Design a protein around this ligand. Sequence first.
Ligand SMILES: CCN(CC)CCNS(=O)(=O)c1ccccc1F
Ligand SMILES: CCN(CC)CCNS(=O)(=O)c1ccccc1F
Ligand SMILES: *[C@@H]1O[C@H](CO)[C@@H](O)[C@H](O)[C@H]1NC(C)=O
Ligand SMILES: *[C@@H]1O[C@H](CO)[C@@H](O)[C@H](O)[C@H]1NC(C)=O
Ligand SMILES: *[C@H]1O[C@H](CO)[C@@H](O)[C@H](O)[C@H]1NC(C)=O
Lengths: 533, 535
Amino acid sequence: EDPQLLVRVRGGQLRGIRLKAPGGPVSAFLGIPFAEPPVGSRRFMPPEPKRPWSGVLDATTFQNVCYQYVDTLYPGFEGTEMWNPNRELSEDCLYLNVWTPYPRPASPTPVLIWIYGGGFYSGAASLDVYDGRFLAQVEGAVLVSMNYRVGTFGFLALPGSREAPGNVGLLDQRLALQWVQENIAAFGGDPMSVTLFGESAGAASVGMHILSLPSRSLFHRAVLQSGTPNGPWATVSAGEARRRATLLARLVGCNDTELIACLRTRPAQDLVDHEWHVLPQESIFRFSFVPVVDGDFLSDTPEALINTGDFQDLQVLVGVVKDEGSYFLVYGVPGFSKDNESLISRAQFLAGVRIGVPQASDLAAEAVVLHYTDWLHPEDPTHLRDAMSAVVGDHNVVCPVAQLAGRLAAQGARVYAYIFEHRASTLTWPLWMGVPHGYEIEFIFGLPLDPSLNYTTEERIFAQRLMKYWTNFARTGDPNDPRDSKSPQWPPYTTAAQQYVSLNLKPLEVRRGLRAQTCAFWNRFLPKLLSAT
Amino acid sequence: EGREDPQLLVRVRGGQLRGIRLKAPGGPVSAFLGIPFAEPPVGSRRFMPPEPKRPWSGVLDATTFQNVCYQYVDTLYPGFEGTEMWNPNRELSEDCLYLNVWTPYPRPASPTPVLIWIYGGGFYSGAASLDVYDGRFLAQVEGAVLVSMNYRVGTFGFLALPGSREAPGNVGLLDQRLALQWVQENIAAFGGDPMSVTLFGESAGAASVGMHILSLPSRSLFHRAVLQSGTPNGPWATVSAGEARRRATLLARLVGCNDTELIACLRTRPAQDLVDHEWHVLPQESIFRFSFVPVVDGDFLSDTPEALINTGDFQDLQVLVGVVKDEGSYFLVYGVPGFSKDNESLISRAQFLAGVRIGVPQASDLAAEAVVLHYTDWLHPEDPTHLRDAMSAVVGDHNVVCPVAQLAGRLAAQGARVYAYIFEHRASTLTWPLWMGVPHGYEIEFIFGLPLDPSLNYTTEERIFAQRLMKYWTNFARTGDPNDPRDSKSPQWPPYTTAAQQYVSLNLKPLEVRRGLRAQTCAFWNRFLPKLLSA
Ligand SMILES: CCN(CC)CCNS(=O)(=O)c1ccccc1F
Ligand SMILES: CCN(CC)CCNS(=O)(=O)c1ccccc1F
Ligand SMILES: *[C@@H]1O[C@H](CO)[C@@H](O)[C@H](O)[C@H]1NC(C)=O
Ligand SMILES: *[C@@H]1O[C@H](CO)[C@@H](O)[C@H](O)[C@H]1NC(C)=O
Ligand SMILES: *[C@H]1O[C@H](CO)[C@@H](O)[C@H](O)[C@H]1NC(C)=O
């Protein structure tokens, strides 16, 4: 019985496992229950604290993945399968994971808490890309990741109802945050230095904890990678949420109480089978069951809340990858595929815009086409292809990120912004997709340090730089290495100067204006245009 | 005659003329100035189509410029060369339908290509007698036969009650046309070739040239065309019949006046009374908008110029079009608060938003917002220097650059041979401040070859530049191609096409080929803006 792997938390004793990282051992405590299993009458319900247990709970292995849709686009293809569930699916899935250095830290150590993405319909803390052993070993970090309910199980809402109030997946996240406050000291973590970080829907989740009062005592700093609470996909109105929930009910043979009672009788896969039939338009980068603006978890729209808050106590690191939109084109836009260069016609570009901007009126669509067309070469297939990616990337990620950065900075927050531009040498997607949504993550987590993965020696060094930025931020609220010069320094993002840095193999380069002209179009003009219809 | 210069005596259809021997720097030229081409459009003839000049007896003296058509005189900067150079330099009169002819001395023995200049001035002003339109240099250096005519402007030339007999509209354009017909009949007497006639004009004159391209009865009267900083399409060059009627009746009201009775009352009014009130009839506070302009009538123009350049077969057409570097700047000091020739005109964001409403008076709030969105530098949204230059760009692109780009692309798509330029040289002699750059109208002195005048103090390099441009223009007039065939050495000027969109830069450096005439920005003005107005 290794006493380094034996921990007492409030619920009882745990036994972890000594894992090997390339440079030494780490302590891993995997599959710790933080909630009562949300099964049976508990489906759609807020999470309840896990009851205490007897003896020593085995925490040597990952627990089940929250029940979710599984991707079938490219079966066997690593580019897609890397995101697919790597453990059995179950509604019994509210478990978290803790990596610490071996042996347990001598002094209280800053905690990083990872919240996975996956469009609020998918994801798991057990994925190889979220492996916290490298950060734990190299940077001495205490890293936590939790599973949270996704899809209908996490976000089906009949706003106002008792039995499906909505946002329970976010409440799963919050309960794990509370668990960290109560228990992390036993692992050598400092509950007074907690940094949330996440990507895509996980970044949006991080943003919603910033905007939700009861979450504010649970962390001190935040990193939002390629995702925001504001924007076109991260939330729905109460009316649209109810609309989608009732439609789904009808589809599966089902007042709120009776409707939800019937839904709870249905096998999990029946719900998943019909998850995608409730979207109002044919679209991409749009998800059926996402957080709802209810007046509860969120007192108002994220756009409203980031515009009025006092965020002076907040430090935030936000950024995007070079090609945010490319991943999504192969999943719905005719003409795109990972198996060719996806050179498209102008008719295909126009068709793609209606799909990429599903809420657009004819005039709004024309405006987007006008902005992104190269009028010198308006029929060039290479430009039209890359512009289609830009439309989806800017609309859904880059410009909402720029807006969040600008808004938070204006309201007194300390903001650092980045663009991640390095394409992994081991990338399995074709060249035209560039640096796609999600492909900075393997570097932040230090996967190039894994000798079995065949990253270049430059990529190993690049990864260590990023781990240092991230952990320095967690420690200080400042990614800058507090012992360096001639670097150059990573300056805070401001509304005026709008400074951000490029993250690639080259040293930091300071740039100004995050797609400033283009994002002014998306953030300022487009809503006017939709309002006028 | 008998004791006079026998080389200055010429007969035309109306009778005998006596011209004058002028000195140009390289030698003498023949000038026949103030030749009447119409009966004076006075009294009962006011607002009426011109009637051909009835033959006169004896030898008419054609040695001096004639009257300027009655018009508003500019008062913004008294005694300032920058404005006064455009002001009338002869007596203002409704008796103003006269034309001028410059030829080599002695007159060419073989038929010589003819250039016909049509002045601009927003259809409310201008004269063929201005020093910047002096035809002696083109005549002497290039051997050109150059003709320029006065045409009625303002109410006198363009007040219209569409459908009426007594004020049918577009009579200023009919004046121009009558002059073209005069050239067809008489220019051979001067050594000119009526089978090789090239029209050129700037601003409203360029728009006029475009009207003649689009009007059927003008089409046998010329063979090639040059449009400098002006087009028949666009927001200022024409008004609808309903708006022309609206403006005419309002003007009538303002001077104390059934169309026949209204026009009859208008004819009793002193010329100056019409001028004193002509600027009170614009529907909005604006710049680059003129009260009395050509009207879309179904007659002179069978449809809007926009429709006409979209459906025509223009295979027979060779056309040279272009713009200057800073089309918008001149207009800012005349209507937008914060702008002046006497300071650097750095403006606030509030002054920029207000200027946009004035520079785009037809715009709804949403359209104006779109313009502001497009022209703002969102990295420095309140930078006064950028806002000032952006305001200029808004006015220049909207009124000139993008209508020119549209005209070039449309005509080329319909089969025409198009050559396009941007003129980027600022004269060393320019009296306007530096922030205005190369303003509307300031390529003209170079085309006409004024730098060749020793007394004007242009640089040696500017003299050479001027001679280059005169060659481009006369080559085009002669052949429909501005390039010199014997010079395969010097950079070639390629035709503008929709596919490649090639145009050249005109400056002190050799020709440089560029592609896309403000492609993104003009796509906004030409394609999107109209959609936005409709919604
Ligand atoms: C979490 C990183 N992410 C980065 C792409 C991969 C995971 N899938 S997804 O939800 O984003 C998604 C979107 C569209 C189509 C399929 C799909 F899985
Ligand atoms: C014909 C050359 N043009 C080139 C500028 C100078 C003549 N003035 S204008 O009609 O264009 C004009 C416009 C606005 C305000 C005053 C004004 F005279
Ligand atoms: C790429 O692949 C898809 C499906 O495989 C196809 O529809 C598309 O036409 C291809 N692109 C080409 C042929 O340019
Ligand atoms: C320049 O002059 C104009 C006209 O007098 C005035 O409106 C403007 O405020 C002046 N600008 C500056 C910076 O002095
Ligand atoms: C140029 O020559 C001299 C400069 O010394 C001056 O007297 C004359 O007025 C100038 N001419 C013009 C048109 O500026």
